[PDB]
Design an enzyme around this catalytic site. Structure first.
Site, short mmCIF file in Angstrom:
data_model
loop_
_atom_site.label_atom_id
_atom_site.label_comp_id
_atom_site.label_asym_id
_atom_site.label_seq_id
_atom_site.Cartn_x
_atom_site.Cartn_y
_atom_site.Cartn_z
N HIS C 97 -44.34 -43.68 -98.77
CA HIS C 97 -45.35 -44.53 -99.46
C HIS C 97 -44.87 -45.05 -100.78
O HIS C 97 -45.58 -45.87 -101.39
CB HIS C 97 -46.65 -43.72 -99.64
N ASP C 120 -55.79 -42.59 -97.46
CA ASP C 120 -54.83 -41.51 -97.82
C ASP C 120 -55.58 -40.24 -98.10
O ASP C 120 -56.71 -40.26 -98.66
CB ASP C 120 -53.99 -41.99 -98.98
N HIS C 122 -54.37 -38.45 -100.44
CA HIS C 122 -53.82 -38.44 -101.76
C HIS C 122 -54.07 -39.72 -102.54
O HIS C 122 -54.16 -40.79 -101.96
CB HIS C 122 -52.28 -38.22 -101.64
N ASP C 124 -51.86 -40.78 -105.00
CA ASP C 124 -50.59 -41.43 -105.24
C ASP C 124 -50.56 -42.16 -106.60
O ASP C 124 -49.88 -43.19 -106.70
CB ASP C 124 -50.26 -42.34 -104.05
N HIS C 137 -43.14 -41.09 -103.91
CA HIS C 137 -44.21 -41.48 -102.98
C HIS C 137 -45.57 -41.01 -103.49
O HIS C 137 -46.57 -41.48 -102.89
CB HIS C 137 -43.89 -40.98 -101.58
N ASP C 228 -51.73 -44.61 -95.27
CA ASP C 228 -50.91 -43.40 -95.15
C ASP C 228 -51.50 -42.65 -93.98
O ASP C 228 -52.71 -42.33 -93.95
CB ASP C 228 -50.93 -42.63 -96.43
N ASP C 230 -51.42 -39.69 -93.21
CA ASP C 230 -52.05 -38.40 -93.58
C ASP C 230 -53.48 -38.56 -94.07
O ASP C 230 -54.13 -37.56 -94.31
CB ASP C 230 -51.13 -37.64 -94.53
N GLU C 273 -45.62 -43.21 -93.79
CA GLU C 273 -45.43 -41.75 -93.73
C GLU C 273 -45.38 -41.20 -92.31
O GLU C 273 -45.53 -39.94 -92.15
CB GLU C 273 -46.45 -41.02 -94.63
N1 LIG Z 1 -49.61 -35.41 -105.41
C1 LIG Z 1 -48.46 -34.82 -104.67
C2 LIG Z 1 -48.42 -35.33 -103.22
C3 LIG Z 1 -48.02 -36.73 -102.87
C4 LIG Z 1 -48.05 -37.15 -101.42
C5 LIG Z 1 -47.68 -38.62 -101.28
B1 LIG Z 1 -48.22 -39.46 -100.08
O1 LIG Z 1 -49.64 -39.68 -100.13
O2 LIG Z 1 -47.67 -40.81 -100.00
O3 LIG Z 1 -47.98 -38.87 -98.76
C6 LIG Z 1 -47.16 -35.27 -105.40
O4 LIG Z 1 -47.33 -36.05 -106.47
O5 LIG Z 1 -46.06 -34.93 -105.08
MN LIG Z 2 -49.64 -41.86 -99.68
MN LIG Z 3 -50.76 -38.98 -98.46
#
Ligand SMILES: N[C@@H](CCCC[B-](O)(O)O)C(=O)O
Ligand SMILES: [Mn+2]
Ligand SMILES: [Mn+2]
Ligand SMILES: N[C@@H](CCCC[B-](O)(O)O)C(=O)O
Ligand SMILES: N[C@@H](CCCC[B-](O)(O)O)C(=O)O
Ligand SMILES: [Mn+2]
Ligand SMILES: [Mn+2]
Ligand SMILES: [Mn+2]
Ligand SMILES: [Mn+2]
Lengths: 314, 314, 314
Positions: C97, C120, C122, C124, C137, C228, C230, C273
């Site tokens: 992402h 998502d 998250h 992000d 990401h 995303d 997820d 993702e």
């Molecule tokens: N907040 C966590 C998880 C991020 C996950 C990223 B995503 O939504 O693109 O899968 C981090 O900053 O590493």
């Molecule tokens: Mn994401």
């Molecule tokens: Mn995510």
């Protein structure tokens, strides 16, 4: 009371897989009649229909096993009309969904004013000319609709059929795999439906409120519920021939059937497309049969909040 | 703040399976107290109650292990009343649901005005005379209800009990396996409930709005949440003794507990019926414990939208 | 019509696992372009971007592979701006992402008035200074937001970035694992979101009504959907790097994307993702890819109620 007449319809020639013939057997082996008796119910078993073999039954154009399917529904129509005459709710254990041609026709001989609720991933409204598979379990609604008279050729085995419901008299719930010609028919005739998009938007509570207000708003009339177990997600009913992801949940199935019970107007029921030979494990089979039994008991009053007799239990 | 007092209640004689005794151990091993501390919380561990064996404890009519269950709840009542006096939310890790007799009684010694939210597939309101199993985890609400005084015989081990809540002071959420005598009691006493039929009709958002308006509409009062993990579907909480399909989802569980947290009135919590020995695989165990931990952290402020301290993080 | 321009972005350096590089390959192998063509669609494949290796790319403070991620998004921005100039909807197959930095930037070069829908688990929206993982990401939204200009240090590889959206121009749907600094940013800037708590309270129907009224109420404008996988529960999309339980259902995913299709304003799409190497079985892989394909076809008009051409099928 709510008296029931069980009809086993161990028939498969509406589609290719023979194992739907075992539907009435496994539902019976799961304790269905005893469980209905444990509940409020007056149950009469009319047995399993003996469908005789028709060795000479070559396709009609695309359409397969037409004489077998036509004869089976002609037979079932007679039997359903009998149990209706005997003042009972017909409960048809299938068998493939082509049987709804006979089940709804027989019912309408006695109750011409019925309304249909069709729970299915599919609309089952191909005509013998729009079908691409030639599988009659994908066509039963087109034989039943008065508006589509003129569009149904003279298919061998069906000359006995008289269309008995109008487009305004059916509601679909659960749709998610509708062929283009089918979608054309739905929009052209203005048939009421709740696809999974509508169930997602509205919730099953509003779907049922709207279904029942649409069919019973003007006046009370008998309800025919035609239930294809593939209306439910394959995580609940995997042992079926045409599974489609993103279905109705177990909960949504029970809610639909609880609400129909509570109208007091259930008049005919179809439990269709259970095929135990298609479960990938013995647990997929039990899962499917148990869910079909639960849906069936809800139709006859089993309520998740509980049930009691009009006695003082204290 | 929201200070908590943990009470382990490793007790199983309200039902036949011994493995619910491991509930407090596996919840603790999963990191529950540390996770609460990572959150907003002031946590005091009051330890695990030592329940002594009662070798002479023959059934009272149908009712099994009565003296063991009575004594265990008498003990738990004392302990809960202590942590309430110490101005903390009692968090009882079970153990079988018969313990709610002690947990709610002890709580009400300090807060007689409490309201109860009961999350369960079951109503747990059989009396010692309506029960068919004789399993006291299916009876705790009947011992607690003032209206059912007169209907509870003098069961050995329970002479210390004084009914502490009225029928208008409890709400059920999640019901789907209610015995006939139980349903009679519900309707007779006019107890408020949201069976799965109601959750299906209304959605969990309206269920919570209505629950909380019913208990807190007239005036703010302490809330006791008694949470049986079988309220959730067995796809989320399989390691439990009486699983019932068609349950509350993981999401619905978190929503219930988030909404109760946000009232600021949570005063007592029960996490009951976790039985690791009943998972069919080690993953069914982790699944069940992880879900129970997640429900518990939501009760004390963990929010799916996120959480931050009143600092400038930029 | 609704013409599409496919861009493969086989890039993984926004996070540790290399297998998201296979996303465009497995989506293509699943029949995505052919299925789009079978539908209403005018599809032009712009191919897979060749991302060159940057051997010298040591962390910037905490932040990993910054030059690789910056260059990849710079490249993707150019390509997306090209297909927008060519009057097509950009469809970016990821990849991790972090690529949304390039996808949204390139899109906004041509349509500065766009609105973003971010599906998502998250947010992000970590900055290079609030991040604890250093995984880019988890940071793309902070590089895009004009309000967070001043809070983004000069990270090598990103000097080309110009923040292109304001806090009022994005809506999140699906949130359930938001870091504390992220939650601070959300509340400080007043960003619109529907966490899973809101989806539980309101239902996905009201969530979409409210999303679309918030972004399109004042005036019609182009929509960028950044999806995303997820965001969906891991029971639907398990082959992904940061799965989180209690997600959007398959049904909810299709509903979101059906509703966005029907606005007629979809202008850019990200499918991010997908990591086949993380499925624990070959079926977890097919499950994940099939779900990603289904979400993608819904974005371009595949409707669960059915579809037909403006011909007379009877
Ligand atoms: N907040 C966590 C998880 C991020 C996950 C990223 B995503 O939504 O693109 O899968 C981090 O900053 O590493
Ligand atoms: Mn994401
Ligand atoms: Mn995510
Ligand atoms: N529309 C497809 C599928 C039909 C499935 C039939 B049913 O709903 O009864 O399972 C066909 O005409 O063959
Ligand atoms: N009604 C049954 C089941 C009780 C289950 C108890 B419980 O909810 O605590 O798990 C019985 O009286 O034995
Ligand atoms: Mn079907
Ligand atoms: Mn059917
Ligand atoms: Mn229970
Ligand atoms: Mn219980």
């Amino acid at each position: 009371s709510r008296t029931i007449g069980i009809i086993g319809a161990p028939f498969s020639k509406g589609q290719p897989r023979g194992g739907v013939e075992e539907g009435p057997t496994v539902l019976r082996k799961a304790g269905l009649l005893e469980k209905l008796k444990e509940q409020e119910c007056d149950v009469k078993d009319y047995g399993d229909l003996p469908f005789a073999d028709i060795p000479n039954d070559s396709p009609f154009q695309i359409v397969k096993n037409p004489r077998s399917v036509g004869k089976a529904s002609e037979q079932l129509a007679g039997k359903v009309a009998e149990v209706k005459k005997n003042g009972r709710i017909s409960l048809v254990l299938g068998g493939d969904h082509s049987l709804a041609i006979g089940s709804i026709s027989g019912h309408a001989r006695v109750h011409p004013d019925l309304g249909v609720i069709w729970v299915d991933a599919h609309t089952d409204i191909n005509t013998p000319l729009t079908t691409t598979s030639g599988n009659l379990h994908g066509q039963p609604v087109s034989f039943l609709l008065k508006e589509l008279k003129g569009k149904i050729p003279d298919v061998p085995g069906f000359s006995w059929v008289t269309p008995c419901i109008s487009a305004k008299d059916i509601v679909y719930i659960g749709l998610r795999d509708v062929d283009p010609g089918e979608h054309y028919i739905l929009k052209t005739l203005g048939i009421k439906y709740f696809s999974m998009t509508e169930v997602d938007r509205l919730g099953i509570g509003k779907v049922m409120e709207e279904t029942l207000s649409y069919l019973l708003g003007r006046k009370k009339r008998p309800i025919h519920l035609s239930f294809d177990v593939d209306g439910l997600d394959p995580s609940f009913t995997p042992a079926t021939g045409t599974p489609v992801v993103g279905g109705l949940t177990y909960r949504e199935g029970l809610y639909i059937t609880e609400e129909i019970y509570k109208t007091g107007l259930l008049s005919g029921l179809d439990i269709m497309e259970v095929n135990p030979s298609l479960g990938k494990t013995p647990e997929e089979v039990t899962r499917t049969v148990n869910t079909a039994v639960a849906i069936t008991l809800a139709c006859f009053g089993l309520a998740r909040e509980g049930n009691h007799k009009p006695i003082d239990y204290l």
